Symmetry: D2
Subunit: 306 residues, 4 copies
């Protein structure tokens, strides 16, 4: 297929490496081996400061990392939820993204280590991320941020959590200035062209009807039509924050993401939606593209934070 | 919207007519208004013979029409389930299709008047259609047909029933030689391009996330992931009859139908799948195309009944 | 990637096989194409030659097992204007004749690079003129002549229809299957499926084109690229067939759209899960030919 | 179709207006009618400074406008070629874009008034744009810009001129750091889906096989396969500058632009290529989107500079 040559070369090496197989490795070792892959993917830019800490929940201590930019020129805040199919990833795996995002936005970024499946099933991740937004708003003065300039950002499962959070934010009348789901999961899509054509041989390998990651995250089949799991099935998608939805051409989740963005437009929400061509899910195998997308998004957020 | 000029004209006249208007018509009146439009759509070709009767079921007497072709060259049988979104249509509305199909197949065709929503909800229609197939097989000798040469055919909601009945056929070890879902509904598709682009202004007008016609047919939201309602969601689609799946280019259901066909191919089932270009759902506004598709289908079945 | 499993397996084998001067490459490919579909029996087969001013053009006349109408189908084989013959598409002619239940005439038009454009187009057109002039001896109706062709054959169907219109020769129908109709560099199908799906094409101008055409000014000639024709109205009723994972898919569909917009009654369908000319799936190839025959039969009824 | 609601509304107003009607209006009137529509499409952001002048060519004096950003943080230069199907448009019609681009890039922007058809046929526009680039390079010290940091930018016919001038730049060993064709015309595309589906009713109305705008710009049919007119037909697309190609989903030119971008990737040119969804050609009817795209472009160029 017509991919970027660097991405094509990455795919050859990735499949030859044989990281994911339950014949040799246990689940925990697969989690770690993929995390090491993701964490080395983009180079780390320097920032102003980095501070690790834990938010105290009634049953858990939720780790976060606060990024301060090299140059801070606004009082906005970006909540960053990492991807990894609800079962892997962390603050470390998308640390390089947070740094570039912070510098481009010229504002504070807070990355969240939400609890993962199979240990903690849906809806734990959604509520962990939402409680972290509520914590940031409650500590707005301490962080030096404006309460009405809080945005959310997330890749893949992180993009799912951005969409799910926005629905909770609306239920609870918590205002968010913006939402940035990048290559999000928003629905159990079985019918689209992107899903059927690129569900195998483009890093993000998905089995149908219900893939491995979803089975591990959800409790049972009734969760499939839950809007916090599948925000696309929501009856109402109006009065949600201004959105920047980003998709990739050879990503199985491409069409559901573009559908979500159209649904927002139709519901009255001001939305930018663009598709990155010649790239696979999450822009893997192309650190140049991954950087450029993050910088573009930062420029737009910075403009909203003005 | 580069449609066939006859189709384009039909849509202009269809929308100006304003048939589906609940302010000035009751549901029963709209059902009849649409039924008259569908019945007059294709002209009736002459056949050998036509026999109306009723199958005796446990709770109902199920009307059927048996068609004998002008020239009967094999002992195949085609069960025909009409379309109409589970809520309208009949043997009369697709009588002209049955006649053309029978002459092209050169074999017997049996059309079924299954019970409709909202009077009878899912899964009544599916079981009425399946029990009609069982009756045909049991009375094979009387009908002069081979038990190994029974095929099923259906348009739209009819195409849904063809997919659903093949799952029951497999469950109950009822041998079918082929299945022909035309422009079928097989899934609650919210994410595909065809659904989002062509769900309004192309005859088949669909609201998201859950359309009016679905709400009338299903009992509750749990039925949305039921394989007999959404066969695309089935975990196993192997060992199903050889399939001829037909879609239309400007049909919101196009992508899910093509997805069904691909899943059959991957599951080992010999499958022909084609998309009819320049046409809307069910080839409406183009009786020529509707005829040609039926003739093609009959020639392929005839070749299977050889 | 999401192809019919039989086709997918064929592609794995095809590229591992690694299928020489040009004239010998022609013969190697022709032998492989001729064994591809098994031959159905027909009523009769007759070889003869049409006398043209500079050439004796070989044809084969097929009579069906059962003849039920006086229609005629002219069959022009594919092979990128540079290879192929009556023999390579003999099995298709037989199935087509039986399905149509009418006489089929296959043409051995002259090939490049020996004979460049527009020779092939004129060889096929003169074959149509011959059949129409000798209708009574053939026992066919002059008003029931259809054309049929796959790939480069599909190109020739489109091109001969333009000449048919220019010269006021009535054709009842035209059936370009997976045709070439334009130098398409911009479509999705072309850019996505031009390597790895049997029909491997280089951009901007492929090897097969370079051999067929005389110079670059032929690229906008309507007899080579019928899609660039100013007027596509008053052409015969069309059955255009394409394949989903074929680089020529979009141009063929475009041709069909242009006909519909020009007032020509058109059926256009795309065969899903298949590559150019339905290679790797003899079942599909047979079924498409059967479907086409049933439609032609209906037009001849 | 599932357009942005604001864009759908713009199309309703646009077709009710009936601007392009050769029964009622002469060509010059239509030119100025469309120029007014393009000029008022996006609001003008304030910049640091604006200067008009003329480059002195052999046979002509080429008007240009120099934009200085509110904040100037690098010594890059972006040459901006306007769109308008080779027959209309000006520095004025795309002035609002130049302003947003200059601010976002935080560098100098120069808009060029190249000569238009039918008065001057192909390849005049291509050479006017190329000579402007050469002038800017020669006067790099006067302008306070680095010779190694010259980029080109263009919309529609402007995008055509960006691709064409990059081929001339390669021929003449003139170095450009980047090229940014937005919704470019790069080929006589008759086969693609986008062309056949969206050539009527989405602002950019195109007739097939050869559109009005092409007939006016081109001398004869032989130019159709000229790489300076159709860069997609170029035998070689390697050693061209780093590219940012931008397309719109409901744009008849969408597929050819994406094809140009892929051809660049295959040829070893580092490229970013994205498609703006729910939008028509040039993001008309959505000034918010048009602004956001230009801001993103500027952020990327700034990062290169």
């Amino acid at each position: 297929m017509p991919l970027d040559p660097e991405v094509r070369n990455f795919l050859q090496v990735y499949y030859k490496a044989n990281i994911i197989d339950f014949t040799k490795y246990q689940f925990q070792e697969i989690r770690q081996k993929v995390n090491e892959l993701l964490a080395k993917a983009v180079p780390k830019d320097p920032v102003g400061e980095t501070r690790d800490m834990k938010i105290k929940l009634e049953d858990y201590e939720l780790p976060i990392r606060i990024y301060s930019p090299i140059k801070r020129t606004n009082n906005g805040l970006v909540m960053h939820f990492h991807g990894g199919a609800w079962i892997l990833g962390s603050i470390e795996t998308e640390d390089a993204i947070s740094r570039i995002l912070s510098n481009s936005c010229e504002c504070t970024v807070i990355s969240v280590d939400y609890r993962l499946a199979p240990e903690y099933k849906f809806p734990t991740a959604v509520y962990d991320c939402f409680n972290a937004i509520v914590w940031a708003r409650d500590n707005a003065g301490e962080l030096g941020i404006d309460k009405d300039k809080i945005a959310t950002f997330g890749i893949s499962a992180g993009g799912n959590l951005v969409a799910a959070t926005s629905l909770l934010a609306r239920d609870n009348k918590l205002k968010l200035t913006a939402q940035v789901p990048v290559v999000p999961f928003v629905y159990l899509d079985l019918a689209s062209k992107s899903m059927n054509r690129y569900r195998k041989g483009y890093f993000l390998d998905i089995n149908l009807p219900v893939d491995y990651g979803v089975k591990m995250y959800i409790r049972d089949e009734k969760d499939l039509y839950n809007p916090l799991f599948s925000p696309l099935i929501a009856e109402d998608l109006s009065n949600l924050p201004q959105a920047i939805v980003v998709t990739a051409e050879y990503d199985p989740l491409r069409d559901q993401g573009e559908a979500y963005a159209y649904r927002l437009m139709e519901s009255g929400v001001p939305t930018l939606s663009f598709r990155v061509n010649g790239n696979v899910h999450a822009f893997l195998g192309s650190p140049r593209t991954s950087r450029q997308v993050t910088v573009m998004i930062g420029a737009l957020l910075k403009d909203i934070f003005k």
